[PDB]
């Protein structure tokens, strides 16, 4: 139970990925649906309108899944690298009643990326059964930029 759930393959459609906000610029759109592992092209990553700790990227599996981990990746423009260094994870069954992922009694601060191309895998112990998943960028270099994948398997 550690297979990609569909971010890179698109088994998870564009409509299923949303965010608190996303950055748009001349001839460019860093929309939520761009947050797919190893994606290439212009504006190939989700970026919030403004970088702050209250932004989030959301994935709706449209069904209950067993999530055993997440894979994060940064992004590089022509020369500058952008990536999330630390992030939190929250989950929900209805998309409104959210619970942060805790570890040993406290909210878990996951260690993310340190460059723009290396994928970093973070396992979830214990795993979670949820329909919705959110990534909360806490720290970053230059810009909050994300390309990701979710690891797990069917609940049934």
């Amino acid at each position, epitope marked *: 139970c550690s297979m990609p759930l569909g971010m890179e393959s698109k088994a998870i459609s564009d409509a299923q990925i949303t965010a608190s906000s996303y*950055f*748009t*610029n*001349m*001839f*460019a759109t860093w929309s939520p649906s761009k947050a797919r592992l190893h994606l290439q092209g*212009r504006s190939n990553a989700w970026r919030p*309108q*403004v*970088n702050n700790p209250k932004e989030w990227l959301q994935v709706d599996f449209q069904k209950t899944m067993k999530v055993t981990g997440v894979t994060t990746q940064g992004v590089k*423009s*022509l*020369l*500058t690298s*952008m990536y999330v260094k630390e992030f939190l994870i929250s989950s929900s069954q209805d998309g409104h009643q959210w619970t942060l992922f805790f570890q040993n009694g406290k909210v878990k601060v996951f260690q993310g990326n340190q460059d723009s191309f290396t994928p970093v895998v973070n396992c979830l112990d214990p795993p979670l059964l949820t329909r919705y998943l959110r990534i909360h960028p806490q720290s970053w270099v*230059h*810009q909050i930029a994300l390309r990701m994948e979710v690891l797990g398997c069917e609940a049934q």
Partner: antibody
Amino acid sequence: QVQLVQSGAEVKKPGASVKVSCKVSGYTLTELPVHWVRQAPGKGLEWVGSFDPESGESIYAREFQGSVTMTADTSTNIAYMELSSLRSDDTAVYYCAVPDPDAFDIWGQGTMVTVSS
Amino acid sequence: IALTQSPGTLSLSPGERATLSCRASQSFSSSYLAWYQQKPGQAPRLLIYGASTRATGIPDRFSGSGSGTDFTLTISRLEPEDFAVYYCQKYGTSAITFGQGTRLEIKG
């Protein structure tokens, strides 16, 4: 290791047309938009227009609406900026620049264009 | 949207803290504000974008802040290499504009 190389200085008479080039190296032109700006002898920066070599879409600055034409040779990775109906007040250094990742991060060396009788 | 810079000419001494302002006609996202530095005979150099993010290679000496209609470029301790002309500007999906510029000279 990216570089934007513009064409040499131009000398033109009123009513003439000048075509400035901007060759990029280290990436495919189509991957990013191309911004154009100029600076008159003792004045500030002024946006002229921007172009998307991927779709061929252009957006002009209010003051340069009907005097600029932007194009690009996708194969040779060269962006072009043609200014027609040149006037003496069009005398300035013209620059191309691309975002990395959002503004005018990388600049060409600039092309001097002098318009006079 | 129009941008207004102040002062026209700022006179300070090396080692001093420099503060430059950029006022906008209408409020807009801080993620569309950039600051550039330009020295004679040279093309402009981007210092900060998104109002507060420094471009790679830019000394920690430079920092930016602000939002809405007021933005600020601050230089903690001025080095002789910092005396030049500074320009702010707003970019975006539909248009870009520049402030008129501020010249930072040495107080002699």
